[PDB]
Design a protein around this ligand. Sequence first.
Ligand SMILES: Cc1cc2nc3c(=O)[nH]c(=O)nc-3n(C[C@H](O)[C@H](O)[C@H](O)COP(=O)(O)OP(=O)(O)OC[C@H]3O[C@@H](n4cnc5c(N)ncnc54)[C@H](O)[C@@H]3O)c2cc1C
Ligand SMILES: CCCC[C@H](CC)CO
Length: 392
Amino acid sequence: SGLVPRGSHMASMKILVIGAGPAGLIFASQMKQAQPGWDISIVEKNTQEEVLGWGVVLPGRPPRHPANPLSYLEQPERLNPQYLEEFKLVHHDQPNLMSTGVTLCGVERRGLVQALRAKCVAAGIAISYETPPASQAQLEAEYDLVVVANGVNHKTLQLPPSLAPQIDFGRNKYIWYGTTQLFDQMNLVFRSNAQGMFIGHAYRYSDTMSTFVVECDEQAYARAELEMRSERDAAAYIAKVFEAELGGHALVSQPGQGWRNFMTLSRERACEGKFVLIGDALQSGHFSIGHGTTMAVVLALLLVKTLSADTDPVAALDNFNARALPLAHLFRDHANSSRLWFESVAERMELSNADLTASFDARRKDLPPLQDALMASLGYALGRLEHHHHHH
Ligand SMILES: Cc1cc2nc3c(=O)[nH]c(=O)nc-3n(C[C@H](O)[C@H](O)[C@H](O)COP(=O)(O)OP(=O)(O)OC[C@H]3O[C@@H](n4cnc5c(N)ncnc54)[C@H](O)[C@@H]3O)c2cc1C
Ligand SMILES: CCCC[C@H](CC)CO
């Protein structure tokens, strides 16, 4: 009974969503909209109040972009998103101002997630918090489908062994800070000092708060002795490194979230048995390309569309795997190309700002464009204008 359900399209479907983050919540709510008679419920391992990170950048003013999760809220303005049109690359303490690609929409992660949870509950999707998911065999025997949307937390779950992740740990160490400095432009700040290489990724996301992600190379992390330093001492050191940008503003990290090597989680299949993966759980990519939540939304929408079709679950999950895996691997490659550029920027500091901007702008040049694949996926997920649904 770990076999994937078969035969016909099911009007009677019992689905568990493991994880109450953007991927799980967009999926659960969009799926319940498409199939109002299905039994969809969410379990979340953490307390309701726990939400990691500070702000996120998202594409466009809502609701222009179907990949922006704010586009799925009736009052996104209540979260006071911040709209950024300019990018400031700081190199050798010299600023270079330029236009962004799409309006960047910075918003608090906590309020985004809480609004999508409340939407899910209002539509009749139950969420159970502090719920360690049951064993595989329990879930297989209790559910028709298990949608695994639990982020990079792979060791917390026992899935079929075909779904075993490939883990790669980044060379830089990073920490996700919040600060009361206000960055009205998206800031990418390169600062080498006697300990090593430090990069700051900063943007305002509320009236009062900015995200300030800091990564450093292994030389900087060892020389600055950041592992032995306390949370406060490390934050004091980093605030001194970035005093030109922060002024006298401080840096805070979230509970239990400290310095990390970025975990690029990859899979070789999106689905097995009753289990199908979306969002970071299917594929994670370095945050330096700004696509994580966008991928969470687009993968969720893709799975909803395949499960909405008049086909059996096995054919639907196969359809998802064959559409989602190529997108996820393209995302991974773009994110890796960016991640690798940041791991080696210490070997590029002699360049001018204009030339470092050009190197940064070219770091994904050899890959097919990620946006082309995203748009193609949304074209499918959103449906097309045709009297009768048919294959293209
Ligand atoms: C430093 C940093 C900066 C980033 N900046 C941005 C940005 O600007 N823009 C952007 O779009 N993205 C950004 N991202 C990426 C973004 O945070 C993720 O890509 C996105 O949240 C993935 O959503 P998700 O739903 O797949 O997973 P998550 O948001 O990780 O949600 C997973 C949920 O499942 C829960 N869970 C885990 N295990 C279990 C279990 N066993 N049972 C039940 N529940 C479980 C977790 O507690 C959590 O609530 C950044 C990431 C980092 C690290
Ligand atoms: C597309 C802009 C992405 C900004 C992101 C902030 C974490 C990385 O620099």
